Ligand binder design. Structure first.
Ligand code: FES
Ligand code: FES
Lengths: 101, 101
């Protein structure tokens, strides 16, 4: 079982740190949601949850995988397949995107 | 380190499962936020994140603590102090409210 949290926080334009939504995270969330179901094996063992800010805004879009405790930053919609294949199914975090373990 | 996820999803009245917000969960979230920000030993080791639905809606308010993987249901604002003291500090989940580990 893995639980994926995607920050979908939006903020007004003046917020100095911006927001994950401004950096494309709603499309990241959408991508995870489309994979996890179009994909039987993901669907049965993975939950994808949208969140408010997880306070790492300038490194966004922020995606956290539990119980592993892997924090990703700068995630693009195009990166979701790699995260799904390598990490969620293959158990290997995508090192290039990790900001914290 | 503990990461507490509080569902704050709201739903229109017709939705059959209701929602955590309609069951009081915004007050649960606010209570966790006030506690962690005024407790010098939690403020540096705990994150409180508001979420959309985590698909356990009839058991709301739903609160999930990672990396432990403890799922709470039916959490009242008045229960937040017990979770903070016994679990977030003490390391013992509040058995009475657990719906999954
Ligand atoms: S806005 Fe996404 S981590 Fe703050
Ligand atoms: S509305 Fe909170 S778990 Fe679904």
């Amino acid at each position: 079982f893995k639980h994926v949290f995607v920050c979908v926080q939006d903020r007004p334009p003046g917020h100095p740190q911006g927001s994950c939504a401004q950096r494309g995270s709603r499309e990241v969330f959408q991508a995870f949601m489309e994979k996890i179901q179009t994909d039987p094996q993901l669907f049965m063992t993975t939950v994808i949850t949208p969140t408010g800010s997880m306070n790492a805004c300038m490194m966004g879009p922020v995606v956290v995988v539990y119980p592993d405790g892997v924090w990703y930053g700068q995630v693009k919609p195009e990166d979701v397949d790699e995260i799904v294949e390598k990490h969620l199914k293959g158990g290997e975090p995508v090192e290039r995107l990790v900001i914290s373990k």
